[PDB]
Structure 1
Amino acid sequence: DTTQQLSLLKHVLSEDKRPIAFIIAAGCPVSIRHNDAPLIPDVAGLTRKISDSFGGNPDSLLMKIIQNLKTTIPNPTIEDILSYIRLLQQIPMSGKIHDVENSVINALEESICELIEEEVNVDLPGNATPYHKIAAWINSINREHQVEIFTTNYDLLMEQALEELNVPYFDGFVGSKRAFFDIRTIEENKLPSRWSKLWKLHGSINWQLDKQTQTIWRGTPSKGCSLIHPSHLKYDKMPYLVMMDQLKLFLNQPSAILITCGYSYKDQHINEVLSQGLQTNPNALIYGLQYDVLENYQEAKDMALKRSNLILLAKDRAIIGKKEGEWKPDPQSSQDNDPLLFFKLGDFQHLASFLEEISQ
């Protein structure tokens, strides 16, 4: 099954008459090897670091909140904890839920934000990283349709890689000193055709908010970024709806394509916007790829079974147009012992190799 999918992917990517996009999740940053350790320990890692940082003491508010969430959420995460804490802050919660913290909840969330900021504030080492290969592919060939990239991460790796190889892009903000969030140009949609576009759905580490005018601006990472929010903030002093609107508006164009790398389809709003855009535009496609085994992704299988234009591919099997298929007999593993049919090409490093092979 490797040959057919590889060839068709080559054909669809080689054409320059179709829009292309990406979705980048924690899989891409974790795929970078450093000191035989993950560059960023992903959502589970960033959750466990907070859990161990405050220790196992039951007197801590954060451990109490985690065990409270265990009753409702089987596997609570940092996103859920942050949303829960912000929610508790929204109302004068002086009750027994916050009896231990009459006002220490603000300090707890402040420390969580600071530690996340310290953890994800790194840079790309060297010029052999996969992001450099991806940017090289992007600027290798001039195409009449712009290449967009959607990022659910907080790190600035992709911006750095796009600047080092000198690929222009527009991420929403326009300006030099304290770039503001320009709105009109976003929906004019008449940027130069050579530009890429980098949308950050979940915010970033450098976004900040000035409460004096209650307006946001992209600057430099300072002590506490107030738009670290994983899509949990105020009403439309908020660009989240606009980035989602941009994803949706992108999906509705004819012969649209999309590729997800490192996404586990565990976020509801992304999933429903993908579903809406996918049904509203039959021509829309999602060539979602999972580095993990498909058996761990019930949500992905449900999505694939509900729509016919979602060519979901996994490590072991594949779902091509509401029908599920497995790997055909091929000598994927030369060794006789454990002849596992694994599609190793779904790894992000291997994906970058694939793109650079296409480009050259």
Structure 2
Amino acid sequence: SYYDTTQQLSLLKHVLSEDKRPIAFIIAAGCPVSIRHNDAPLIPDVAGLTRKISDSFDSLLMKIIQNLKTTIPNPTIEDILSYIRLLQQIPMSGKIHDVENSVINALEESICELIEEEVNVDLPGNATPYHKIAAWINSINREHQVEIFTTNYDLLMEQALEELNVPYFDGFVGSKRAFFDIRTIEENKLPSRWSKLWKLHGSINWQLDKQTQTIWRGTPSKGCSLIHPSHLKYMPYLVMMDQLKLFLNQPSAILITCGYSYKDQHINEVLSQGLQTNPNALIYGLQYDVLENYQEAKDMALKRSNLILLAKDRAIIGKKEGEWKPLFFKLGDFQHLASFLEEISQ
């Protein structure tokens, strides 16, 4: 019925100080909102993007919002984008909104242009938390290299990891076109020094070249992006989720989620399947909010025993909810976690 913070932090420090156990990370949208460049946040959260789209764009937008809200709660950018692409799947879909089509195709391009111009914010000086994480990554010559998964569309991880030049590999091989490779993902025959970074929700520099229906990464073009959450193309998403699932099956695997809101659906299910398949897997869920705001996380914690969910005020461990011993546990904030990692690095 009661827990103490110090013992939990001591256990986590003991865990992170072992090189035998493979380690990974989840950098969701809650990390960029934790750093301030101007008076406004450097990158707003999903609610910020929804508000910006609402106040920036009108009648057909409100009609679409009403149609989706008729059976769903407060929406996100992913919801409206998926709805738009689903409408684009049907050829004569312009009669649903009485817009005769051919206008949604331009509205989605305008939204993509706005998002891609807004997310390009550049990184501030070398004091960023991501720089500390990158420095911690190469500090120790671990025999199992640390993998990183990010749901962010931006490129803060790239800039931070290149400012302190470190081994890196994201799946694309090449110099001019950087053609996406699938085989080299599957044999996993790479030297242990090379780090692995994988973007589950897609980046902003990804361009669909069409024609031969091939994917390539590189310089970000204007308007042409691949921001798709999942899409339904006839794919990086499926193979990359398979890679995550394969990682979760490794013996004595540790995965830490920072700034993740657990509101996604496929990610939660694959995490639950990985936890149930191998009982030796262990997931550290780190949040910065009241625990009552994560119902799916509570259900997963009450279902899967080897999932540790830690919130600001309460914490549920081993299918038993409790409260901290005299908000506490500031480790949920990205800045505090980065400071913790950089102090444990030395």
- Compute the TM-score of the two structures, normalised by the length of structure 2: 0.97
Q: 1:94 to 1:201 in 2, by over 3 A?
A: closer
Give the Cα separation in 1 of the matches to 2:97 and 2:62.
13
**1:123-176 CA-partner distances (Å, limit 9, x unpaired):** 111000000000011111110011000000100000111111111111000000
| Offset of residue 36 of structure 1 | 2.4
| Offset of residue 225 of structure 1 | 3.3
Given that residues 283 and 306 in structure 2 are in contact (C-alpha distance below 8 angstroms), is that contact kept between their aligned partners in structure 1? Answer: yes
Given that residues 167 and 195 in structure 2 are in contact (C-alpha distance below 8 angstroms), is that contact kept between their aligned partners in structure 1? Answer: yes
Structure 1 unaligned runs (5+)? 329-340
| Offset of residue 210 of structure 1 | 1.2
**1:271-328 CA-partner distances (Å, limit 9, x unpaired):** 0000111100101111101111111001100000001100111111111111111111
Give the Cα separation in 1 of the matches to 2:29 and 2:93.
36
Given that residues 94 and 100 in structure 2 are in contact (C-alpha distance below 8 angstroms), is that contact kept between their aligned partners in structure 1? Answer: no
Segment of structure 1 superposing worse, 214-223 or 64-73: 64-73
**1:77-119 CA-partner distances (Å, limit 9, x unpaired):** 1100000000001002345313124210100111111111011
Matched, 1:42 2:28: no
Q: 1:191 to 1:203 in 2, by over 3 A?
A: same
Structure 2 unaligned runs (5+)? none
Given that residues 64 and 97 in structure 2 are in contact (C-alpha distance below 8 angstroms), is that contact kept between their aligned partners in structure 1? Answer: no
Give the Cα separation in 2 of the matches to 1:49 and 1:351.
29
User: Per chain length, whose mean CA-contact separation is higher, i.e. which structure has more relative contact order (CA < 8 Å, sep 6+)?
Assistant: 2
Matched, 1:359 2:342: no
Give the Cα separation in 2 of the matches to 1:66 and 1:132.
39
Q: How does 1:279-358 map to 2 (within 5 A)?
A: 279-328=276-325, 341-358=327-344
What SS does the corresponding residue of 2:70 show, helix, strand or coil? Answer: helix
**1:28-87 CA-partner distances (Å, limit 9, x unpaired):** 111111222210111111111111112xxxx53212111221211110111000000000
Q: 1:128 to 1:95 in 2, by over 3 A?
A: closer
Given that residues 87 and 93 in structure 2 are in contact (C-alpha distance below 8 angstroms), is that contact kept between their aligned partners in structure 1? Answer: no
Q: Give me the identity figure in percent.
A: 100
What SS does the corresponding residue of 1:72 show, helix, strand or coil? Answer: coil
What SS does the corresponding residue of 2:322 show, helix, strand or coil? Answer: strand
| Offset of residue 233 of structure 1 | 3.2
Given that residues 168 and 197 in structure 2 are in contact (C-alpha distance below 8 angstroms), is that contact kept between their aligned partners in structure 1? Answer: yes
Q: 1:94 to 1:278 in 2, by over 3 A?
A: closer
Given that residues 63 and 97 in structure 2 are in contact (C-alpha distance below 8 angstroms), is that contact kept between their aligned partners in structure 1? Answer: no
Given that residues 205 and 225 in structure 1 are in contact (C-alpha distance below 8 angstroms), is that contact kept between their aligned partners in structure 2? Answer: no
